[PDB]
Amino acid sequence: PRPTVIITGASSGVGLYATKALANRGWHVIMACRNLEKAEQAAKNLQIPPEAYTILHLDLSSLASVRGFVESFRALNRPLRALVCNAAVYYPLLKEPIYSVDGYEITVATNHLGHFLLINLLLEDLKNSPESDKRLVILGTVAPPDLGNLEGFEKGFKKPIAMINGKPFKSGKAYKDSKLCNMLTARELHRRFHESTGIVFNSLYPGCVADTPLFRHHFPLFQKLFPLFQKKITGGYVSQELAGERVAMVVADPEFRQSGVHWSWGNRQKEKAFVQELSAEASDEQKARRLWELSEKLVGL
Ligand SMILES: NC(=O)C1=CN([C@@H]2O[C@H](COP(=O)(O)OP(=O)(O)OC[C@H]3O[C@@H](n4cnc5c(N)ncnc54)[C@H](OP(=O)(O)O)[C@@H]3O)[C@@H](O)[C@H]2O)C=CC1
Numbered sequence: 001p002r003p004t005v006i007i008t009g010a011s012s013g014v015g016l017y018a019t020k021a022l023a024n025r026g027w028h029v030i031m032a033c034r035n036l037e038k039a040e041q042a043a044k045n046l047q048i049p050p051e052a053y054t055i056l057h058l059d060l061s062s063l064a065s066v067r068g069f070v071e072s073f074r075a076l077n078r079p080l081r082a083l084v085c086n087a088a089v090y091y092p093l094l095k096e097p098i099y100s101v102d103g104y105e106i107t108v109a110t111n112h113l114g115h116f117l118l119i120n121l122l123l124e125d126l127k128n129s130p131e132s133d134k135r136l137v138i139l140g141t142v143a144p145p146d147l148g149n150l151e152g153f154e155k156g157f158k159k160p161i162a163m164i165n166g167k168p169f170k171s172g173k174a175y176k177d178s179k180l181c182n183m184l185t186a187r188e189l190h191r192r193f194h195e196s197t198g199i200v201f202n203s204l205y206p207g208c209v210a211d212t213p214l215f216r217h218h219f220p221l222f223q224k225l226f227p228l229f230q231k232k233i234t235g236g237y238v239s240q241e242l243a244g245e246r247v248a249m250v251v252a253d254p255e256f257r258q259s260g261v262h263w264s265w266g267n268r269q270k271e272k273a274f275v276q277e278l279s280a281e282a283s284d285e286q287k288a289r290r291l292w293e294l295s296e297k298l299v300g301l
Pocket residue numbers: 008009010011012013014015032033034035058059060061085086087088089110139140141179205206207208209210212213214215
């Protein structure tokens with residue numbers, strides 16, 4: 001009997017190597033991906049044992065697809081022990097915003113809003129599971145990110161709104177903004193549900209995984225040289241395998257069962273995890289709650 005874990009965006013990068021590390025630990029991985037062929041080719045190239053994973057379609061940019069995936073997973077009749085919100089898109093140099101089928105700027109829609117709906121639906125499945133060590137793990141972070149007063153969300157977040165704070169569109173900051181929402185969501189998940197469910201709600205920063213397709217929308221020269229830069233200059237480089245293994249630790253290792261925490265190993269890498277409380281910024285306490293409320297409104301809860 002294999003414990004089940006859902007990993008979004010498992011077809012490459014951190015999610016792919018997290019699938020391999022969890023599979024090697026005896027978990028069964030739900031690879032929730034939007035590109036089924038790309039995901040299947042990725043698992044076979046790594047020779048991940050086929051009995052350790054199953055691939056289901058999930059497009060986080062479509063709220064109907066999120067709801068559809070939840071039904072598809074429930075039809076598996078597999079109790080859920082863990083959910084990893086890993087998928088993301090990064091546009092550093094996108095001039096004009098792209099809007100999802102539901103009408104939302106694609107970076108926030110994919111990175112935050114789709115995950116926000118998935119989390120709220122799958123919370124039922126995590127509650128009902130008989131496992132005692134259940135975890136919800138969110139991939140976080142370490143143009144600075146600024147949500148302002150959530151004016152863009154406060155006003156419905158439809159075009160021409162393209163930023164959470166209502167300011168004009170900046171694709172790179174939109175990514176930073178979306179990962180900030182991931183942290184605040186992990187912070188709200190713990191505050192709202194940990195004492196009453198026993199589920200562990202954590203975020204994690206594995207380091208600079210300079211090799212992943214996250215930089216696919218960057219200049220081709222950037223993708224070629226960023227690993228060497230991160231390796232020989234900043235020292236913040238981490239391999240895809242090490243990042244995947246760190247996700248698996250926070251999901252499965254007993255040393256990481258404390259809830260409401262952000263795990264990291266530093267900006268510059270050595271050769272030991274740091275604990276940071278998610279509610280540390282006490283002045284973001286109300287903005288975190290309103291973000292949650294506005295997100296419930298945007299995804300139709
Ligand atoms: N790379 C780094 O240095 C760091 C990364 N992170 C986080 O790591 C996580 C992994 O990203 P990484 O592995 O780096 O880059 P990848 O692009 O390799 O992982 C991105 C994943 O998200 C999936 N994805 C994107 N849009 C959607 C969508 N609409 N529906 C479903 N799946 C989607 C991609 O699938 P497709 O290929 O089909 O888009 C891919 O599987 C991200 O959350 C990122 O924020 C955090 C800190 C540092």
